[PDB]
Design a protein around this ligand. Structure first.
Ligand code: HEC
Ligand code: HEC
Length: 62
């Protein structure tokens, strides 16, 4: 299983044009927020070529 989310997810929307999880977990915000960056596994295509893993709460549970 993917790691559980150790914090609440109640305030964060994820829809076609909005992904509030990335305000902290994106590559550009991870250092500043303390949140672990989403890894290249979340960006790669089917063959490994380098997010495609976008709808975060389909996989991660809080
Ligand atoms: C900043 C205000 C955050 C927002 C927005 C989201 N997350 Fe977060 N998350 C944050 C911190 C400071 C941490 C703890 C440090 C760490 O990264 O461990 C986390 C942790 C997670 C994890 C655990 C990663 C791990 O260490 O194995 C997951 C899977 C995670 N967060 C997911 C997640 C999702 C799906 C969000 C939106 C619904 C989300 N986070 C928002 C800070 C912040
Ligand atoms: C299922 C297809 C997933 C979706 C959608 C997202 N994540 Fe994920 N995440 C998944 C797995 C199986 C793992 C384990 C290790 C791996 O990288 O493959 C993870 C891990 C994370 C972590 C830890 C650091 C990392 O390994 O990338 C974080 C912080 C995390 N996931 C965050 C996260 C966010 C914010 C997502 C939406 C933008 C997201 N994941 C989607 C599986 C899946």
């Amino acid at each position: 299983q993917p790691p559980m989310v150790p914090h609440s997810v109640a305030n964060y929307q994820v829809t076609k044009n909005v992904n509030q999880c990335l305000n902290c977990h994106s590559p550009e915000n991870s250092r500043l927020s303390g949140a672990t960056r989403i890894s290249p596994t979340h960006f790669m295509d089917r063959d490994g070529k380098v997010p495609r893993r976008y709808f975060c709460l389909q996989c991660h549970v809080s």
